[PDB]
Design a protein around this ligand. Structure first.
Ligand code: MYR
Ligand code: MYR
Ligand code: MYR
Ligand code: DAO
Ligand code: DAO
Lengths: 178, 252, 29, 285, 178, 252, 285, 29, 29
């Protein structure tokens, strides 16, 4: 998908098995796939970060497509949830798709230290955000059986970066000539 | 209702019963140049209603394989009535715009267009050394550019929508004034942008201030593909004023 | 060029050269 | 009070981040979490809206994230080389068309904005390599030649007289030379990007090359020919002071290939061209 | 003409073709032939210039010689006018020679940028000033059929130079000895 | 001095050191249309300096056998910059004018031109029954009409200068706004005329409001005939405003 | 207020250019465009008089165009050379009859005025070329010998004692020497041009040589003979401070050939002698 | 030698040497 | 940055740099 706009969309469809997993990524601001987002890029110019992250998801199916999804944030000190029941025990939002297309899940600042390292560090790993089917993707007859979903990320009122450093998300392997 | 909108500019009125609000670029509403920021000393001509009205560009067809489209302002309006005439008869020009992108489908269709207004969108060339995009290619007029259709010429700009045609990632275009046309919620997008430049007025013939980029981030899908789904763009200049009158510039 | 404040905690914001460009980093808004 | 404001400068607490207030469980028909990204606006939902938070007093500050701080760090923009190999007269002087486009590190930071206005602090770090053993007495001359002024063609050119141009003379052993330059543009701000040409023909130039001419820096070893050859490398460092920036933009995702242009090159395997690390699949963290 | 006082005069005479061109030069303060005038020389000691220029023309024919001339300034973004009609569409003054010998055409500061480069620069080219016959050079019998015209240049109340630099209008190709 | 004059309109300034005063047609200085007299309800566009400036027409040669010349307004300015564009893009238009006729000779030359501005100068045909002057012939543009040079076409207007091209005697033209260019006293004529019509605004394409007629009542004479004596006309619109914007009218 | 005036100095806004006011169409028997150059006066017509201008607030300043600014820049006026070839005693010292006529760059600027009065700032840039490898410890002595004082004839001449004359000693490694000199003339101003002689005979001298005697600068390598030969080149830079100038004049159109004289040389093709670029014809821009 | 002004924005126009020629560039008229 | 006391035995506790870390050893409690 890299090199295609499809790398930005997650596909949803009618499931045959209940409570299936949709996606799972790390909450770490400068980890992949968060690294190249604007906040990840700016974060890579600093060494420490703090605050809560705001993850938004916009449903792009037809107006007649329904769906209920569970978005969960698992604080550190445990592995990523293996099931919806496991994920559900942490911070989560049950998103009901309807008239309003977008939903936001806030990943609260839950940490021992006031700041965490921007670069991947064991001691400061922020946790995981997983997505599961709460019910199912339902559609009327003569409606496409798959739909896309877009994911956004930004910082909350208390996001803050500290200790300026050069980024590792861009390099120069030769002279830039005229 | 917050879903409805009516925009009247000069002798034109546009409506939409399914909007997603409107966006005022950088929070600044277009306005005429003040004597504090002015440099050119001659009295500016301000055509008003004959200039500041909606001009509808050529419609495009949106289908499953579309990669995107882009238009550059004021270039796209160079042949649009009094506004067009004025930009060629004068050395200097200044203007704001109301961009209204239209696209209706049905409640059984799905698709998402990312509508963005980029300031100083300096296009890039790929694997062509230091050869830059040719004037002709960055001045397509009302026809704009259909991404991924041209049989490349050396001076042909980039067609990499995921790299914004300039070496930056698509996902970050949201930093510029933008809106989404998500077929399940809205049938149009409205963007009001002010004049943005490092100089108070500029040559409208050689400097394109804004660039309207439309990229379908979510493929158009439905069970009735035979029905064509077009995309129509109507742009209205605002506070258009020109300076340095002389003969009409003919570009070759 | 000296901006002398008093509070004593007297503050001297001296500007050793006659050109504005010569001064150091700016204050935050 | 400028003194209280002064303390804030010293402690770096000019811009403080807000606190987190205690929230409670809610059951309402007003759902802040739901919104519409189509509008082009970001949902301003905060942690107190989605979970039951406690009261926490924030002590973080945003001072370091200011544009002045971000762009206010000296980075290398050029490496001038004067290598005396076989002809002193020809190899003892050089010129450089000034620009901030040759070093990716600083270029990328400035290019995160469309327009920027600032004063410049230039520090030079000269290092004399004793190729043959001794270096003698090295005295350098750095002359700023604005566009139009005559550019010296020989090491003894009359232009070196600097009757009007600004020249900085450095004597080996003395501290690194440094000077400030006011906002040099003929416009109100520097164009970081320019979607324009210097004409309307097929052969017209495109981009910032049309608008950003800062002149030439002409270097010269003032000292006359010495027995032992030396290689003088002068690194130019640039820092932005009193900065202002407008219209932020996406960071450069691919490598820079040329100055004054956004041009780039892609390989057959594009994932190697961007910083994006390929995922095994959607569920593999 | 260089090396002769004639290089300073423009000759006028009875025309057989209407609306003929008399002269055409660039408005650029440090371009030729403006370069060696005092203002051009001083301008060459600076890098940026701004403001309006004042061009004056003194008719030196007999007291019985009449003439109407059109002096035009063509702002940039177009080529020099090919005809009087083309020139006339820009800034212009119709000069009627009579009792008062001199006329002044003011070239207004019409530019995108606040300043322009003193040295010849594409982006900052100021335009052209052309001169055409509005009517014709008419004389009574027994009067010389040609007359001279002198051209002057100076800066208006808002002319300003910026950024001192060494001039390129003078050089030293050897030692100045005693 | 009462002999000198300077007229500045927009970016143009005209001078004359030998004038015979100026004439303001019917004593009314041109002015914009008031809401009391207005009829068309849309907001009028007023180009100002880009429109209200001096446009110099093609020069004519005055010699011993010249019978006269005439131009019709606004027809003569249909191809003159922004003013011309505006008159074709709009259904309605309204304007006043400053007419400056130039003609210099010498103190050893003699001749007299009668410069007149006629409102509703409806031309006649001679001995052609009820066939009236063709649209083409009454719309010569900036070239005007040189009396007594055309190889008649059926729809060719009258060339009888002594009968004012309409069946009235030349001597009575002095009832209309006019001036004389008597070579022994003045080298130019200046006439400022207001908008005269039975309607507040009109179509500039089909209705010529004013007609500039120049008839040499006293033959040009001198002992230096080889020296050509031209006649140049510079007209400047005043308070030009247009209404009813649409596409540009192309006349065939 | 000196403080408000101080701010003006820092911002360089001491002398502001006027604004452009809005003008309107006119029809009058008063024609400002017409005038008479015969009077010797320049027509003071402004843009508002010929076209319909808008109101524009000028923010340009004339500070940089001041005489102090124009002449207040250090330019090279002399290059003293002490090249030890085969005789230390003879080659270790030299003299120079002081003048500002040897370097075209600065000479031309001062010569745009008939008389000028100013103080001088002299900065010296010495560079020791190690011809044989090492330079040892180089100590220089620059003695200002006013007209009349004894000029040293040997490197150990008693005149070097500087019992009364001003001498500047520079030790290699230390920063560049610099000192100021008050207005040195016996007149109220320096003659930039002088249409006079020092007598009334056929053999009388003409020009500024008659009036402008500033003495001699005698240099010497204080250090005694060293094993390794060196070539010491000392460049003298001059800056005018507290300047005043009278009666402006045309800029030098041709090259300078000699000091204290306006003499020049012309080739067979004079267009090559002046900066005027030949035109193809009157209508070719 | 010090010209101390007050406005606080206190201005010190010091002249380190006893000879007028020693001072820097002049102020504009 | 100057803490000027008076007693005259005037005490100037100057802090040449704008960052707290830049200052010298601390005072005793
Ligand atoms: C400001 O514009 C002038 C800067 C002067 C620099 C010198 C600062 C030191 C002043 C010491 C004065 C002591 C007071 C008695
Ligand atoms: C002026 O003519 C004398 C110049 C004196 C130079 C020294 C300047 C520093 C003064 C510091 C004094 C501090 C006041 C307590
Ligand atoms: C404190 O925050 C600013 C530190 C300023 C350093 C300069 C100290 C010397 C001040 C001398 C002023 C003399 C008073 C007249
Ligand atoms: C002489 C040392 C270098 C000074 C550089 C200051 C000018 C910076 C302008 C940046 C414009 C650009 O290159 O895009
Ligand atoms: C000793 C260093 C040189 C000092 C020169 C100052 C005197 C300048 C007088 C200029 C007279 C002239 O040469 O025309």
């Amino acid at each position: 998908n890299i090199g295609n706009v499809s790398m930005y969309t997650v596909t949803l469809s009618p499931q045959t098995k209940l409570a299936e997993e949709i996606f799972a990524i790390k909450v770490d601001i400068a980890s992949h796939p968060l690294a190249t987002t604007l906040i990840g890029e700016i974060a890579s110019y600093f060494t420490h970060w703090t605050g809560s992250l705001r993850f938004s998801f916009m449903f792009c199916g037809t107006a007649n497509t329904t769906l209920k999804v569970l978005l969960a944030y698992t604080p550190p000190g445990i592995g990523k949830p293996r099931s919806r029941k496991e994920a559900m025990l942490g911070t989560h939002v049950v998103w009901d798709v309807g008239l309003q297309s977008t939903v936001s899940l806030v990943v609260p600042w839950i940490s021992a230290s006031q700041y965490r390292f921007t670069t991947p560090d064991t001691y400061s790993s922020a946790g995981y955000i997983t997505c599961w089917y709460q019910t199912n993707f339902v559609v009327p007859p003569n409606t496409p059986n798959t739909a896309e979903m877009l994911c956004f990320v930004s910082g909350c009122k208390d996001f803050c970066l500290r200790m300026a450093r050069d980024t590792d998300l861009h390099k120069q392997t030769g002279p830039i000539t005229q | 209702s917050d879903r409805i909108i009516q925009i009247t500019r000069g002798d034109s009125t546009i409506t939409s019963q399914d909007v997603a609000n409107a966006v005022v670029g950088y929070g600044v509403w277009p306005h005429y140049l003040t004597p504090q920021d002015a440099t050119a000393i001659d009295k500016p001509t301000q055509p008003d209603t004959s200039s500041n009205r909606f001009y509808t560009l050529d419609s495009k067809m949106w289908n499953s394989t579309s990669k995107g489209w882009w238009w550059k302002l004021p270039d796209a309006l160079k042949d649009m009535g009094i506004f067009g005439e004025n930009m060629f008869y004068h050395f200097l020009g200044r203007s704001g715009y109301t961009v209204h992108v239209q696209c209706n489908a049905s409640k059984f269709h799905q698709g998402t267009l990312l509508v963005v207004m980029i300031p100083e969108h300096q296009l890039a060339t790929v694997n062509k050394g230091n050869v830059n995009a040719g004037y002709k290619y960055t001045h397509p007029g009302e026809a704009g550019r259909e991404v991924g259709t041209q049989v490349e010429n050396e001076k042909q700009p980039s067609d990499d929508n995921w790299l914004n045609f300039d070496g930056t990632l698509l996902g970050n275009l949201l930093i510029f004034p933008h809106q989404f046309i998500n077929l399940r919620s809205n049938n149009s997008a409205t963007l009001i942008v002010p004049y943005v430049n490092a100089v108070p007025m500029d040559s409208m013939v050689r400097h394109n201030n804004w660039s309207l980029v439309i990229i379908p981030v979510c493929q158009l899908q439905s069970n009735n593909i035979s029905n064509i789904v077009p995309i129509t763009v109507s742009i209205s200049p605002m506070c258009a004023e020109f300076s340095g009158a002389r003969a009409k510039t003919v570009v070759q | 060029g000296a901006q002398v404040s008093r509070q004593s905690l007297n503050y001297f914001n001296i500007n050793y050269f006659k050109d504005a460009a010569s001064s150091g980093a700016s204050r935050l808004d | 009070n400028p003194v209280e404001r002064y303390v804030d400068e010293v402690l770096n607490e000019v811009l403080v981040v807000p606190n987190i207030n205690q929230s409670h469980p809610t059951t309402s028909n007003a759902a802040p979490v739901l919104d519409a990204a189509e509008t082009g606006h970001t949902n301003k939902i905060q942690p107190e809206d989605t979970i039951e938070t406690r009261y926490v007093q924030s002590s973080q500050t945003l001072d370091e994230m200011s544009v002045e701080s971000f762009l206010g760090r000296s980075g290398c923009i050029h490496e001038s080389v004067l290598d005396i190999v076989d002809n002193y007269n020809d190899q003892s002087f050089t010129k450089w068309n000034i620009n901030l486009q040759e070093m990716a590190q600083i270029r990328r930071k400035f290019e995160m904005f469309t327009y920027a206005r600032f004063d410049s602090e230039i520090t030079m770090v000269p290092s004399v390599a004793a190729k043959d053993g001794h270096i003698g007495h090295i005295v350098m001359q750095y002359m700023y030649v604005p566009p139009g002024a005559p550019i010296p063609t020989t090491r003894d050119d009359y232009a070196w007289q600097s009757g009007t141009n600004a020249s900085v003379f450095w004597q080996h052993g003395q501290p690194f030379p440094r000077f400030s330059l006011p906002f040099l543009s003929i416009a109100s701000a520097y164009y970081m990007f320019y979607d324009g040409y210097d004409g309307d023909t097929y052969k017209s130039r495109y981009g910032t090359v049309v608008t950003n001419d800062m002149g030439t820096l002409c270097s010269r070893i003032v000292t006359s020919e010495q027995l032992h050859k030396v290689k003088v490398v002068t690194r130019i460092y640039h820092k932005a002071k009193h900065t202002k920036a407008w219209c932020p933009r996406p960071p450069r995702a691919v490598q820079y290939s040329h100055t004054h242009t956004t041009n780039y090159k892609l390989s057959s395997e594009v994932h190697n061209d961007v910083a994006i690390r390929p995922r095994t699949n959607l569920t593999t963290v």
